[PDB]
Amino acid sequence: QLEDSEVEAVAKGLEEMYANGVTEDNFKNYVKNNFAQQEISSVEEELNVNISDSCVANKIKDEFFAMISISAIVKAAQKKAWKELAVTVLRFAKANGLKTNAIIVAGQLALWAVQCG
């Protein structure tokens, strides 16, 4: 299914952004410090989120919560099982044609689970 090199790149990004907690600030500051504007803008358009300028209605977020267990995600982040977390949210993304930067996408999905779950 998922290419393991992309899984590990996503897991490493999650580990770096969220080493000190899954927070909106840690996500946005990590993304703005590590990705080009163009890459960020593509994710913002795909997910209808604002990253480069808590819980409000979002299409994709609701479909994410209907398919993927919030409890499974939060447990993975609690244990710092970042590659477990990555495969779980990447399975949702590839299914739904979320083809923008997988590290940013995974970061946003993990944030949604923790801050909105």
Numbering used by the authors: 58 to 110, 126 to 189
Question: Would you copy out the relevant sentences from the publication that reported this structure?
Answer:
In previous work, we described the inhibition of Candida albicans virulence following exposure to the 68 amino acid bacteriocin, EntV, secreted by Enterococcus faecalis.
Unprocessed EntV136 was recombinantly purified from an E. coli strain as a selenomethionine-derivatized protein and crystallized. The structure was determined using single anomalous dispersion (SAD) phasing to 1.8 Å resolution, allowing for high resolution analysis of the structure. All residues were visible in the electron density except for the first two amino acids, the last two (169–170) and an internal region corresponding to residues 90–104; this latter region notably corresponds to the GelE cleavage site, and we postulate that there is natural flexibility in this region. Interestingly, the structure resembled two “clasping palms” comprised of three α-helices each. The first three helices are in the N-terminus of EntV whereas the second three are part of the C-terminus. The two palms enclose a final C-terminal helix, α7. The NTD (N-terminal domain) external face is negatively charged, while the CTD (C-terminal domain) external face is positively charged. The positive charge of the external face of the CTD is due to the presence of many lysine and arginine residues, while in contrast, the interior face that interacts with α7 is hydrophobic/neutral. α7 itself is strongly hydrophobic, as 11 of its 16 residues are hydrophobic sidechains.
